[PDB]
Structure formats: structure tokens, C-alpha cells
Design a protein around this ligand. Structure first.
Ligand SMILES: O=P(O)(O)OP(=O)(O)OCc1ccc(Cl)nc1
Ligand code: F3S
Length: 309
């Protein structure tokens, strides 16, 4: 059995920064460090940081006074930010620079009383944070997931309309949504393409190349990782069996019995150690040395704030 590795895969620049923010805070101030929501959507990363004295909480009311609080990589609403700022808290913000960029555009639209449409998935924390940058009642902020959602959306002034996207969407599906928005609202304004980050784009491109060669694709990442789910979905839609797995224990032997080529990738929040262990398990089940596929170069790093060095 041939084992192929997608490239690129695993940690992005936002995740690496957010994790270091928590680690460095723990190293500088000791435990406990409070973190709002899972810092990134990976069980292993979260369980680790929890074992080292990070405390994860869904609401700021759970956090005690005088504490250090960190915002997760997914970003937070103005409301949440103001609720933290108005209390006895030292705040560090692990929100990804590429989410912040989108937030800044929503905030601008809010200041102009000009309506904005977000493409994304209801209930996801990035969506809550991004929608939560819009406060002006004279405009409006709308969420669409599909072309059908676009087909039933009505806005107050479609002459003054802009759109934004979640960072971790399917590139292909998002393209269909934007085509719809432009047919329904010809004057809508947006970025050149969308707000899908380089890491999401690159991992989807990489898993396409992988699924072209592999019969079965394993995607390392947690169930609540949106970007990981898109990788597995992309593979499946290409007609390959694909499985989202947290770690090597989830691999069921039937999945790779009599499979000549298995591919492995990882979402943006999945540490490389999990991939290494997955590969060790596949090798127990017959696989050879893992062959990395040739990949688009990634070179971006985001530094921690100077105060957390
Ligand atoms: O569930 P998703 O959003 O894919 O989150 P993830 O698995 O934490 O991945 C890194 C990340 C962090 C922040 C953002 Cl807004 N997008 C991606
Ligand atoms: S938005 Fe940032 S957290 Fe990673 S998946 Fe994209 S670089």
C-alpha cells in the first residue's frame, strides 16, 4: 500500500500564532489563563492546553475578575469585545489577521449605513464575530449559505451593497454563491474573488491533487473544524472514500483493506504529530514509506504580539 501526503497540509499561520499566544501567556503569567471558545478547533491542541492550565469558556461571565483572557483565532463580536473591555480583565487577542481584515470591512460598511452580505455557515463562531462587527440599524447585515438563500434575500437598498465571506469555505461552492449574488444584485461590491484565506485555498488544491491519486483519503482534524470538513467533502465529491479523523485510533481496518493507494492530509488546526501517528498506523496495516506530494510553497508567518514574546 502506497501512502501519499498532501502538500500543503496541517498548521496555518493563524493557528500557529494563536497557539503560541496561549502558550506564551501561560509561560509568562502561569496558570490559569482563560480562553474564550476553543482557541482553534482541534481536540488534541485544546486538551493539551487544558492539561497545562488554560481554561476554556463560552461566555465572559464565566471568567473571574483580575484574570487574563484570550480571544480565540475565530474572532469575536464587538459586543463580546466591549463586555471584556468594560471589566477587570487583561485581554490578548488571538484572532487571525485574515479574519481581522474581514472584520475591518464589515465595520466600515456599518459606519456608512450600507448593507453587507456574509457568505458563511449559521452558528459558526467566525460568523458570529464577523456579523457582530455590524451595528448600524439604518443598514443591515445578512447571512447567506447557498444560491437558494441568495434567491430569497431582499435588501433595502441594493445600489449600496457589499459582500464578505468566511475564511474556510469551499472555494468551488463559494464561487456558485458569488455568481448568484452578482446576478441578483448587479451593483454589489466585493473583493476580487472572496475572503477565503490562502491556507484554505491551498489545502483544497492539495487535497484535489491527492484524491486524483489515492483511492481513500484520511483527513486529520476534529469534527468541529470547518476547513477540515471541506477537505473530506472535496475528496468525497471526487468519488473517493474520505474520513475525518482526530487520531490514529479512529482508523478502521476495513477502510484500507485491499487499498493500493491511501492519501493523508490534515486541516489547518491539526498538529503534525497526529499525522505522523496516523502514518505509523497505516504502515502497521501494510503501508510503505510516506511519499509527500509536491506542493505550492507557503511562506507566511504571523508573529505573536511583542508583549507575549
Ligand atoms: O472551524 P474552522 O473555522 O475551520 O477553524 P479551525 O479548525 O480552528 O481552523 C483554523 C481557523 C481558525 C480561525 C478561523 Cl476564522 N478559521 C480557521
Ligand atoms: S483564516 Fe487564519 S486561522 Fe488559518 S485557516 Fe486561514 S490562516
Amino acid at each position: 500500500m502506497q501512502i501519499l501526503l498532501a502538500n500543503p497540509r496541517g498548521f496555518c499561520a493563524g493557528v500557529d500564532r494563536a497557539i503560541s499566544i496561549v502558550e506564551n501567556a501561560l509561560a509568562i503569567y502561569g496558570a490559569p489563563i482563560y480562553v474564550r471558545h476553543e482557541v482553534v478547533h482541534n481536540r488534541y491542541v485544546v486538551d493539551s492546553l487544558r492539561e497545562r492550565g488554560a481554561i476554556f469558556i463560552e461566555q465572559i461571565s464565566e471568567v473571574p475578575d483580575g484574570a487574563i483572557l484570550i480571544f480565540s483565532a475565530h474572532g469575536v463580536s464587538q459586543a463580546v469585545r466591549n463586555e471584556a473591555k468594560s471589566r477587570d480583565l487583561t485581554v490578548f487577542d488571538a484572532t487571525c489577521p485574515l479574519v481581522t481584515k474581514v472584520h475591518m470591512e464589515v465595520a466600515r460598511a456599518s459606519r456608512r449605513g450600507e448593507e453587507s452580505i456574509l457568505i458563511g455557515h449559521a452558528g459558526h463562531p467566525e460568523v458570529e464575530g464577523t456579523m457582530g462587527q455590524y451595528s448600524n440599524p439604518e443598514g443591515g447585515m445578512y447571512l447567506v449559505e447557498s444560491p437558494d438563500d441568495v434567491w430569497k434575500l431582499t435588501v433595502k437598498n441594493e445600489e449600496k451593497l457589499s459582500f464578505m465571506t468566511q475564511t474556510t469555505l469551499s472555494v468551488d461552492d463559494t464561487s456558485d454563491v458569488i455568481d448568484a449574488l452578482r446576478k441578483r444584485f448587479p451593483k454589489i461590491v466585493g473583493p476580487r474573488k472572496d475572503d477565503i484565506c490562502y491556507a484554505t485555498t491551498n489545502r483544497q488544491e492539495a487535497v484535489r491533487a491527492l484524491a486524483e491519486q489515492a483511492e481513500v483519503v484520511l483527513v486529520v482534524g476534529s469534527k468541529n473544524s470547518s476547513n477540515s470538513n471541506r477537505l473530506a467533502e472535496l475528496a468525497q465529491r471526487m468519488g473517493k472514500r474520505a474520513f475525518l479523523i482526530d487520531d490514529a485510533k479512529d482508523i478502521q481496518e476495513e477502510w484500507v483493506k485491499e487499498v493500493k493507494c491511501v492519501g493523508v492530509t490534515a486541516g489547518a488546526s491539526a498538529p503534525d504529530i497526529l499525522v505522523q501517528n496516523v502514518v505509523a498506523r497505516l504502515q502497521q496495516l501494510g503501508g510503505g514509506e510516506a511519499i509527500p506530494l509536491e506542493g505550492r510553497e507557503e511562506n507566511i508567518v504571523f508573529e505573536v504580539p511583542k508583549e507575549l514574546r
